């Protein structure tokens, strides 16, 4: 089974090397493909209380085009400066605001933030919510193995 | 001051030994199997997260249990039940 499932893994790392490297290596690392091998680098932890989310994903200077992910401001330490950026996948901070898409009506999006989700409605902040607020479907196959009693 | 009476059948103790041996091995191996199964599921969740981005409809139909249509809402899926249609129509 493992020797079989590797065939899937070799493809998944091409889709998202970040998640694959974080899952296999064991540390939350940033990875990119270097041909037929994957290069990784450790990511710096940041406390959840040092991040602020901006209300609007639209660009006041660019009409028609607007961010697909929320803008955020984070500080590495309490005496550090304010560093701007945009939210990524699975509690990821992006320094470059290069995630641009044409703005479309009926824009309702959920994004992972902290321990829960943040919901934006027509490219504007709507509200925070918890993980349990959204119904969950399980990808796990249950195997209930019990021991022999003495 | 008392005299201890000994039973004439040691077979109960031998049965205890055999049962303990078999039970201990079985519990060890099944425990390892259970732990490995858990790690395998946690490991496959990563592949599921990416296949969800690739093709939301099939992943939603597989996980939910009903043929539904799904579309990503950022970091989560929105699903809707699909209406059956008979093949002869």
């Amino acid at each position: 089974l493992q020797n079989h499932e590797l065939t899937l893994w070799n493809e998944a790392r091409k889709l998202n090397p970040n998640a694959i490297a974080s899952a296999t290596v064991g540390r939350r690392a940033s990875a990119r493909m270097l041909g037929d091998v994957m290069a990784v680098s450790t990511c710096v932890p940041v406390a959840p209380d040092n991040v602020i989310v901006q209300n609007s994903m639209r660009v006041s200077s660019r009409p028609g085009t607007c961010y697909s992910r929320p803008l955020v401001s984070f500080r590495y330490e309490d005496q550090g400066p304010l560093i701007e950026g945009q939210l990524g996948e699975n509690n990821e901070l992006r320094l470059t605001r290069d995630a641009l898409e044409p703005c479309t009506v009926g824009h309702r999006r959920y994004f992972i933030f902290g321990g829960g989700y943040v919901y934006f409605e027509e490219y504007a902040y709507s509200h925070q919510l918890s993980r349990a607020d959204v119904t969950t479907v399980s990808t796990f196959i249950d195997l209930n193995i019990t021991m022999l009693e003495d | 001051v008392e005299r201890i009476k000994t039973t004439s059948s040691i077979e109960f103790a031998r049965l205890q030994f055999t049962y303990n041996h078999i039970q201990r091995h079985v519990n060890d191996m099944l425990g390892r199997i259970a732990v490995a199964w858990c790690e395998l599921q946690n490991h496959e969740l990563t592949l599921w997260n990416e296949a969800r981005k690739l093709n939301p409809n099939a992943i939603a139909s597989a996980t939910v249990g009903r043929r539904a249509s799904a579309r990503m809402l950022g970091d989560v899926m929105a699903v809707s039940t699909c209406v059956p249609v008979a093949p002869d129509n």
Partner: peptide, 20 residues
Amino acid sequence: AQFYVCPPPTGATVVQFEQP
């Protein structure tokens, strides 16, 4: 041997994956 027609998904119903 049965077909399904799927209306476009809406934000009314939202499901996520169970965490490890």
